[PDB]
Design a protein around this ligand. Structure first.
Ligand SMILES: NC(=O)c1ccc[n+]([C@@H]2O[C@H](COP(=O)([O-])OP(=O)(O)OC[C@H]3O[C@@H](n4cnc5c(N)ncnc54)[C@H](OP(=O)(O)O)[C@@H]3O)[C@@H](O)[C@H]2O)c1
Length: 335
């Protein structure tokens, strides 16, 4: 293929996403070159293009220099090793891999470290495997590592139609918990068909009174939230059961630990940003995959629902997510 990389000239409009020409490089002695086959759009990246959330992680910028014209996209993806640095033993040409937080997976070729790659589950297609990394790693870290969901507990999952939400539903049910889901009105029927008993409208905070009624005022043990505008944070805090665990993956206008404690001192509050975690420790993703890989191997977890767009339609792929037309993941295939 003609090497390209997805870029923008400035912030504010999806239509300015552009496939910019790139040189083909060779890997240095401890690098690996991966030809990308499938790369999904993440909601953060929509916010990035629109100028709503500005990346500070330097890995998201060419040369580590922060500016719109240097911003790259693709916080996860899948592909095939096509060249290996001379001194690398861990990978070989033809290996199929998941890229862990590359930051530039919307590129024809990515050069990275061997420790930035994970073995793709062999029985999944590239597009199927492209649904896994960010959504499941986020949901697993929150539900398992932080909140420690137990069988029988009541777990409220907001925006359960989206990528993180769909992964969280699968994981919560794998852990034997009772899922309460919210989604937009026209997606409720879809989530009920997936087998969720309790599905409510996410587009107002009236779900809180509905949860109170369903639980006879007891509330829920765990909340997995990304909706931070309006009164969504305090309304969620108020429907936590005694000692409930509040997982927050939204990053705009979130409360501090002290603010949450003022309202409910018994609640355990778990805000986090996976991008920060990945940069902090490269063993973090490796240890999560040690737990998750076998679940995808066995079929205990399954790929998310997805919709494919070819690379030439990348603007429409981003718009599909912006307008929230989806269930699961939006996956872009490369030529
Ligand atoms: N902290 C972290 O490490 C981390 C990691 C991954 C994602 N996130 C964040 O978690 C969220 C999920 O990301 P994603 O990439 O998987 O995207 P996504 O969930 O597939 O898409 C965004 C979701 O937001 C919901 N939504 C947006 N505005 C809403 C509103 N006003 N009322 C109700 N629902 C609304 C949509 O609901 P409908 O489907 O009902 O339209 C949609 O499901 C995003 O906010 C993202 O920034 C954080």
């Amino acid at each position: 293929p003609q090497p390209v990389q997805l870029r923008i000239p400035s912030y504010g409009l999806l239509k300015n996403l552009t496939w910019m020409p790139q040189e083909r490089r060779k890997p240095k002695s401890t690098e690996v070159e991966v030809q990308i086959k499938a790369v999904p759009v993440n909601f953060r990246e929509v916010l990035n293009v629109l100028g709503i959330f500005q990346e500070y992680i330097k890995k998201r910028y060419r040369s580590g220099i922060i500016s719109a014209e240097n911003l790259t996209f693709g916080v996860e993806g899948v592909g095939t090793v096509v060249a290996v640095g001379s001194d690398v033993s861990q990978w070989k040409v033809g290996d199929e891999v998941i890229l862990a937080y590359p930051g530039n997976a919307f590129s024809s070729f990515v050069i990275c470290s061997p420790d930035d790659l994970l073995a793709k589950p062999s029985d999944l297609s590239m597009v199927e495997a492209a649904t896994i990394f960010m959504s499941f790693f986020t949901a697993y870290y929150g539900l398992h590592n932080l909140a420690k969901v137990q069988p029988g507990e009541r777990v409220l999952i907001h925006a359960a139609s989206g990528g993180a939400g769909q992964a969280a539903v699968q994981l919560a049910q794998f852990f034997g918990s009772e899922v309460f889901a919210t989604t937009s009105p026209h997606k409720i029927s879809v989530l009920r068909e997936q087998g969720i008993k309790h599905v409510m409208n996410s587009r107002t905070t009236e779900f809180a009174s509905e949860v109170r009624e369903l639980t006879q005022g007891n509330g829920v043990d765990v909340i997995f939230n990304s909706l931070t505008h309006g009164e969504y944070i305090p309304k969620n805090i108020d429907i936590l059961a005694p000692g409930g665990r509040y997982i927050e993956i939204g990053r705009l206008n979130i409360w501090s630990h002290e603010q949450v404690s003022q309202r409910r001192p018994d609640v355990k509050y778990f805000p986090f940003d996976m991008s920060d975690e990945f940069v902090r420790d490269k063993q973090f993703h490796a240890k999560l995959w040690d737990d998750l890989a076998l679940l995808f191997e066995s079929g205990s977890l399954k790929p998310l629902p997805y919709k494919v767009f070819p690379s030439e339609d990348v603007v429409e792929a981003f718009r599909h997510l912006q307008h929230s037309k989806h269930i699961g993941k939006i996956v872009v295939t490369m030529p």
